[PDB]
Design a protein around this ligand. Sequence first.
Ligand code: CTP
Lengths: 227, 234
Amino acid sequence: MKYAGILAGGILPKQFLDLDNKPILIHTLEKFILINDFEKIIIATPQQWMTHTKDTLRKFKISDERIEVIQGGSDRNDTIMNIVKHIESTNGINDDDVIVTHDAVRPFLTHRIIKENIQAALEYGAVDTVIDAIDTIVTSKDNQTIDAIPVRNEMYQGQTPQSFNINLLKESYAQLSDEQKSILSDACKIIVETNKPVRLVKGELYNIKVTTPYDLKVANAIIRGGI
Amino acid sequence: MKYAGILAGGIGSRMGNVPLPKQFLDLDNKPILIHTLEKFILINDFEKIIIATPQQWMTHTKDTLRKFKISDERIEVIQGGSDRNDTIMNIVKHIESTNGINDDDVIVTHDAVRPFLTHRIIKENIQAALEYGAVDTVIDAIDTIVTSKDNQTIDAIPVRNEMYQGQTPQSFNINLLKESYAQLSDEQKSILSDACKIIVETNKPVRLVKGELYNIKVTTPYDLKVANAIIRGG
Ligand SMILES: Nc1ccn([C@@H]2O[C@H](COP(=O)(O)OP(=O)(O)OP(=O)(O)O)[C@@H](O)[C@H]2O)c(=O)n1
């Protein structure tokens, strides 16, 4: 079975800001609603915003019975595991279950990205949505001087969705210590650190994350430009 | 002395590595190249602003300078090289044959299609190059960076706090860059697309100067639409 997990547990908080007279969260959700194969599309948000989010869905005439709003966690991976735990306590986990986890503030993902994510999770178990690194990547351990500059052709910018077999995600995450979880910049590293493969799905240059005011200006350009 | 080297070699196509003259595309009724140059003319401390571009584009570059009334006596157009680093060295060699290199000379090298750099970025580059010899303009990674050696599976996912997206300008004390570059083999002349990697690979420090989220490289139609937004709005 196929599940969507829309991650709105972050901090008016950026996931509810208006983008073209419709909240960013709604733009993303609309993309997930058009996929009929999700058994449930689970939105996780902070406790104080859950009823407000449900109300905002009602405001935009979205009544799809597949949508459930749940309480998120204290960090991003805590939120993903909250969604899996909700699934486990509601439906139980099937051996073939997959979860498509996705940033609420990335409203410009496409049908193709979701379908490739779904298919990639079913076939290989774990997948990251990426594009070729737009810049040369440079590293630093002191924030003052370069430590290393890797070969540019091996570098990718991680985006979302990130998609997983639910049992694989649960068991892998269960293996990590609290310190090992302290560094995880994303969810796919849970899998990498537990020595299972993570597949690549190509994103889009316009699949941006709205985290600064600049990103909202770029997003407005993306929407008015139709892309 | 302080020199600017504006790198106008084009943007290579995935298949063929054909140079496309993206710097001549229109951004609000002025070529991208003209916006970038206008940013450099405002820095009074530059002794020369040398644009190096392929031989086949030099006349059109000069014609474009004329059409947009760019009359600054410091602007000069020269022939570029076989790759980005060879073009940088074409600029260095031109400086040496014209004025001669001083021990304190620095060169601020910059992508022609990065028109949104700021006065602060340029001044900080100059100061950092004078004091420390080598500088990369960078921003904190916003995305998690992931690696792949086969374009199919992840190889590693490093700590995001240590990852940065490199931009330009990249600025160097000229004799230092020359000495470091002179240390590289003919083979390493092919891999190193980046100019700061010359220095890193030759075991000299490179300072970080922080860039801007909007200091984008205008290389795609998508990037061009966003650039039109950035420009119209500030
Ligand atoms: N405990 C958390 C933290 C983040 N996210 C979501 O992960 C996505 C990525 O946003 P990010 O860049 O990681 O930043 P935030 O943690 O949301 O907030 P800040 O801008 O302060 O970093 C966001 O949609 C966020 O809502 C989440 O679901 N639960």
